[PDB]
Structure 1
Amino acid sequence: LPTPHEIRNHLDDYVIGQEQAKKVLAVAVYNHYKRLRNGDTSNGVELGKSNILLIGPTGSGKTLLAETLARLLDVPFTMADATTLTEAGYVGEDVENIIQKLLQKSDYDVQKAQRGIVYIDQIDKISRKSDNPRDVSGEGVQQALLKLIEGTVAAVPPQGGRQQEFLQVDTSKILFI
């Protein structure tokens, strides 16, 4: 279903001035979904994970690519923020909340949510700067995010409960930007 030729043209309609970047996203997007079509069934073992790392100046269209891609793509999309993220959830937020918002977009569809896309803005915010230290936005956030990005099942109460049960939604399948 994914097409790298057409997707580049589609992004051109909404984005201009970044031709090389469109080629990179089309390959990773196509490869990631192709992997899930036949999961770990090929002869090649230890297949490299397909992820995306957007790096560009201000006003370059980073937030724009996430919006245009969401409209064109059929799977649900989410737009989170790293500034709100905090470690051990004191008063700010928790990493697991990112999965809760994804289900709201997918209407509590685990089969449809695992094939979703994730985009985190202001990645530099979580940069570890602990020279003079506890730190709630530094190492703690990156450590929790790395655990999630590695691929692990996290408990998420579906609908919040009327039960004491949680669903083990996978994470290795979901993509991250």
Structure 2
Amino acid sequence: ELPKPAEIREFLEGYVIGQDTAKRTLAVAVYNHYKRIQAGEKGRDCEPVELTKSNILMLGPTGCGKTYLAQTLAKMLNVPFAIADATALTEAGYVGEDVENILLKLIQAADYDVKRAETGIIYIDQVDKIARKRDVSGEGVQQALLKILEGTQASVPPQGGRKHPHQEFIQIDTTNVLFIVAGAFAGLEKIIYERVGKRGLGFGAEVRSHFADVMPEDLIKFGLIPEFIGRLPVVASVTNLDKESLVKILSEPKNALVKQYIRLFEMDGVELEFTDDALEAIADQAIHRGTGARGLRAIMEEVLLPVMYDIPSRDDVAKVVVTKETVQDNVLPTIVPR
């Protein structure tokens, strides 16, 4: 089969709005992952090449669809997928989660079949929050993931084959296991701006008034060891969502935001509607909310808070959120049944 990167992105467009460079990256790299499977499992020359993965580092502000673009990507993979956080991970030793339990999440996602899990994709979320300036959960997780991100014959420390008291370990080769890692890297856009921005001062030097020009020296100045960035050659560059994307995130995707509020009011038998000026007014107050598309919910929970209280105590059929209800709190139109 091998779905093309246009076909992978077309699936990602159904859920994720905006994010063109991140969807093209995560469609190309999944397609190269689908191609380096059945080239290491079939074999042909010339000069027969052992292919090597290109792991992905996703970078963009919160709410802008890093996890959600991986959860969307999770719904289409022919390969096993394991989502995991690095904030639970520690280096081998100390009390927290080991960096081979993220492999166990992939073994569990492959129905305990290692030959499918060697072809898997692991999504390590929040790798900006294992950042350094010893630290055993934010310096040593780089040191422990790096054998996993390059390929090693790792053995998962609990649960080898549904817990037999002999051989609690099963082997996994992480050479062909693609890793997509992500995080906001919130202080990094102040670090990148020191290089590409050139905030100059004084007589002479030019004075001036984000995640697409990311060199590894910025990630070291963010605090990440130089070995860890080399295992992550691909930067996906998730972008900040403008007003025009956040209007579409309300209504265009499959599990869109206003689609799951009109679902909530249909459980009250009430047809919730939005004027198009109201959807703009919600997205006007979400870019100022500063948390991405997660702030689109924060507006619509307080626009609809007096509505969601009294409407299930009433008999109505249609509720229309006009733009006057969003910019300031306004009364309810409430088309009565008829």
Q: TM-score, normalised by structure 2?
A: 0.48
1:127 deviation in Å?
1.4
Instruction: From the CA coordinates, give the structure whose radius of gyration is larger.
Output: 2
Alignment of 1:141-156 (within 5 A): 141-156=141-156
Q: 1:76 aligns with which of 80, 105, 122?
A: 80
- Higher share in helix: 1
Distance in 2 separating the partners of 1:44 and 1:18: 36
The answer (yes or no) to whether the contact 2:36–2:52 under 8 Å persists in 1 is no
Counterpart of 2:116 in structure 1 is 112
* Structure 1 residue 167, shift from structure 2 partner: 2.5
Q: Alpha carbon RMSD of aligned pairs, Å?
A: 1.9
The letter for the 1-side match of 2:91 is E
Once the two structures are TM-superposed, the CA of residue 73 in structure 1 deviates from its matched residue by: 1.5
Q: Can you list the C-alpha shifts for 1:6-51, whole angstroms capped at 9, x where unaligned?
A: 2111111101112222222221111122122222754275755322
Match of 2:169 among 151, 166, 171: 166
For residues 84 and 19 of structure 1, what CA distance do their matches in structure 2 show?
A: 30
Measured at CA, do residues 48 and 18 of structure 1 come closer, stay the same or move farther in structure 2, by a change above 3 Å? same
Partner amino acid, structure 1, of 2:136 = V
What secondary structure, in the 3-state scheme, does the structure 2 residue paired with 1:79 have? strand
Q: Identity percentage over the alignment?
A: 66
Whole-Å separation in 1 of the counterparts to 2:114 and 2:102: 14
SS in 2 for 1:143: helix
Find the residue that maps to 2:54 and give its secondary structure. Answer: coil
1:99 maps to amino acid: L
> Is 1:23 matched up with 2:27?
no
AA in 1 matched with 2:122: V
Which runs of 5 or more structure 1 residues have no equivalent in the other structure?
none
Per-residue Cα deviation, 1:123-147 (whole angstroms, up to 9, x for no partner):
1111122xxxx42113211011011
| Paired residues of 2:36 and 2:51 also in contact (CA < 8 A) | no
What is the CA–CA distance in structure 1 between the aligned matches of 2:12 and 2:60, rounded to whole Å?
17
Partners of 2:12 and 2:168 lie apart in 1 by 42
Where has structure 1 moved over 4 Å in runs of 4 or more? 44-48
Contact 2:52 2:175 (C-alpha < 8 Å) held by counterparts: no
Matches within 5 A, 1:50-129: 50-129=54-133
Residue type matched to 1:135 in 2? D
Name the count of aligned residue pairs.
173
1:138-176: per-residue Cα shift (whole Å, max 9, x none)?
321101101111110012322221423632211101110
Other structure's SS at 1:78 match: strand
